[PDB]
Amino acid sequence: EETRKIPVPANRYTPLKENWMKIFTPIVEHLGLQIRFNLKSRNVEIRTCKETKDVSALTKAADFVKAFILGFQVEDALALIRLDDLFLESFEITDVKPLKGDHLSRAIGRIAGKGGKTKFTIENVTRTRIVLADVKVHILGSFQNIKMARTAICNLILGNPPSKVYGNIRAVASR
Amino acid sequence: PLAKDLLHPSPEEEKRKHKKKRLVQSPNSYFMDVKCPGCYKITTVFSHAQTVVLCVGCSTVLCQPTGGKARLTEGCSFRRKQ
Amino acid sequence: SGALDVLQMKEEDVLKFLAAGTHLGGTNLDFQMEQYIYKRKSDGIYIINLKRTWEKLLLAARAIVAIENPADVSVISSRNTGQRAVLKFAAATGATPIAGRFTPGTFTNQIQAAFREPRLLVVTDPRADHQPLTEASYVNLPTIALCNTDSPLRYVDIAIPCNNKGAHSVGLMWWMLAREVLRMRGTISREHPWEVMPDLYFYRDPEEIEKEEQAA
Amino acid sequence: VVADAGAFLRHAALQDIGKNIYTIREVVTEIRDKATRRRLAVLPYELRFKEPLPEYVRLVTEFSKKTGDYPSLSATDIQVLALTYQLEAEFVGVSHLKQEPQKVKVSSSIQHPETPLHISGFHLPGGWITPSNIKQIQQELEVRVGCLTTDFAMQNVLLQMGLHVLAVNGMLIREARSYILRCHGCFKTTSDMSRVFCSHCGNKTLKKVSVTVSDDGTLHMHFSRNPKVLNPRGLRYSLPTPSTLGAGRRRLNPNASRKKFVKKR
RNA sequence: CAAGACGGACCAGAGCGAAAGCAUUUGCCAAGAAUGUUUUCAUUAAUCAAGAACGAAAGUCGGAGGUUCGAAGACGAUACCGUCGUAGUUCCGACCAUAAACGAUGCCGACCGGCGAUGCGGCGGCGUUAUUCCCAUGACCCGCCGGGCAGCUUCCGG
RNA sequence: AAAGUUGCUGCAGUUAAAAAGCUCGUAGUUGGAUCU
Ligand SMILES: [Zn+2]
Hints:
Chain A: It is found in: Nucleus, Nucleolus. Chain A: One of its GO terms (biological process) is ribosomal small subunit biogenesis. Chain A: Part of the small subunit (SSU) processome, composed of more than 70 proteins and the RNA chaperone small nucleolar RNA (snoRNA) U3. This is part of a larger assembly, with chains A (about 180 residues), B (about 80 residues), C (about 220 residues) and D (about 260 residues). Chain C has 6 helices and 7 strands; from the N terminus they run αββαβαββαββαα. Chain C has about 220 residues and is an alpha/beta fold. With about 260 residues, chain D is an alpha/beta fold. Chain D is about 25% helix and about 10% strand. Chains in contact: A-D, C-D. The complex binds zinc ion (ZN). The structure holds 2 RNA strands.
């Protein structure tokens, strides 16, 4: 039998606990897999059981939990369960240009925008889901959608104003 | 506020304040009798002493200097003055 | 109030005060209300000294007796937990009650159907009643208030230090203020306790009232 | 077998095991779920509606206010308790049940109140969750008339009275353990897990305290001897002059380091 | 295996320094703020013309080394981009003395609201921990004082 | 004179013109309390 463990950081223990029900149910009723979370090692372990359905989907289940560890909502990770052409791309803001201190914070605020609005706009433009950590940013979507969202994010951290990126990404989505 | 007798503050407030910011400034330190366990003499020791005070008869270490109040060794007794 | 051997605290008074949970306050403290705290116990709840709030109740009662006309005294409560109580406080003396949402411009806009010109204001909760304090600061209107420890004292002239979040404490303290004003107003005497039970002024939850008449 | 509204909410189809299925109208006409309403029209109608006598409802109210579970339960809960007490009274002799409930014993512990003991999906050291156990995991699982109560208040008062309580499964309940909210200001307990303000004093002062009851009528209730829970650290801050998302941000005390270019609303 | 580079994560509403600036271990050297002080001297102080010391990056003279990156430049596509790449980026010794060198905000002193967080030092105290540690000490908890970095709130006044 | 736009009386220097990159430093200016 195969097993796979997913670590849980301390900032994700309470979200994991609070909606644990809608996390362990879609694995045991749909994919027929057998899971637990140990507190001594702080690890969510998934292993296959006897009444397993479609064994070559175990990885998908792991991706489920993995997405919820990165900060994605459980609906988007359940979409990662359903659709097969869904991928995850992660990178740092300083990983493409060195920004230090207040410049880094301003780049984060430019990606987010007021009320998160700019970030939210990009999602509805690209049919993706973006959660950005303290310096990390994660995009969930299909390949070309990831490329479009990465294009918009990289342009926003270049220093291009959010208005121009807003208009250009709407025009690119029109195409 | 706006009504408090600055001439007659409450004694717990005066003891609460910084030693220079009282109405009439006063030290927080004291002198004390120290009785070594191996003898029965009396040694006059400053509470915030900076030197290692030795016994006049036993030549033993009485207090150890620290950042603040001096640390008396175990076994010796002390009594404040005045 | 004056060490005159007739207006002091009694054992029944302190017993019913500790029964109703009035003496215990909130988790915040405003620096203008430090003189009503006895001490800070380690649990995190500021206790309110009982003799201080007794003297403050007596001062508020002396302020409210001094008006000869009971009709021009406004008694207001926005939170429901005191609402019906202030209505019965009207039945105490005839002071006009305002329960529920307060209409802006009631005290300051003279072209209104509800335009009142009181001579004292008594307030259940200063935080919920920020608009009537704001309007009372425009028309030379003094203020009585039931003030918790986490309550601002702006435009408040007598702040009764009490727990006002709980229904029992606020209903009790309204009943006690009514008993004091009726005692030295001229209606009742001191040899006999007031026949009105403190539980009559208490706000009742609809969940409580749907199963109160079941036990008849 | 008295069916509570929780059994209707959980689609508990136990009409085959029990024959004395009786309940009150308002516990079934207050359900707002459309699937339960659709399922109610398919099930056979062996259910009968009746109203308990005023005397027995009253006596239920006095020992409900003696046991301290008075504000946690509603009028429909009172009606359900009265109906099951009447059914027990006119089926079996009334000398079996008792009154004057036993005083609660004190037994503290060093574990934190938010320790996730007996949560199925976790593992304290084995402890594994299979799809075959999902139907098994409903609650803590261990003759003529029973009860289909779900909420812990009614089960608590029934086990305090010694009345045998039943579940969605065939067997009865021997032990019932849960969490309640106890006030540390006015010393009043509330079993409502979603409330945040207290009942008597009215402060935001309720804290998690565990309880466990048995069949004999013996209850024991555990505090926590941890000074982390009871300290006034983040409780005082100056206030400005006058839903579930962003929950962990409120649990930080205001007098702490937030990032310089972020803002709390 | 070697060569030079650079010290991630920890790393913060943090700390130190006159500023520019400062992050692998250990050892040596001499400074330093705050604290504590019933020590010593007794006005020895505050501010700056002249004058002096340090002063990011780039740049200039000489020695050493050139890992990566890379102005100019050579190619390929379309000022943008890619491949290669010189000076430079690195160390040593002298020049240069300029920055959005920012709090776009002289220095010293006094008074004038509140709160609780944090770094350091001092003080007082129930208590828990070094598998109910058999007194002290480190780690926590509560409270106070002093100098700090830094927040929130206020019809102080402007 | 208006011009408190030359300011001793009596102006200003975050964002409008404007505080030296930083520190030390003679001249100059100012200097705790105390003696009928
Ligand atoms: Zn309470």
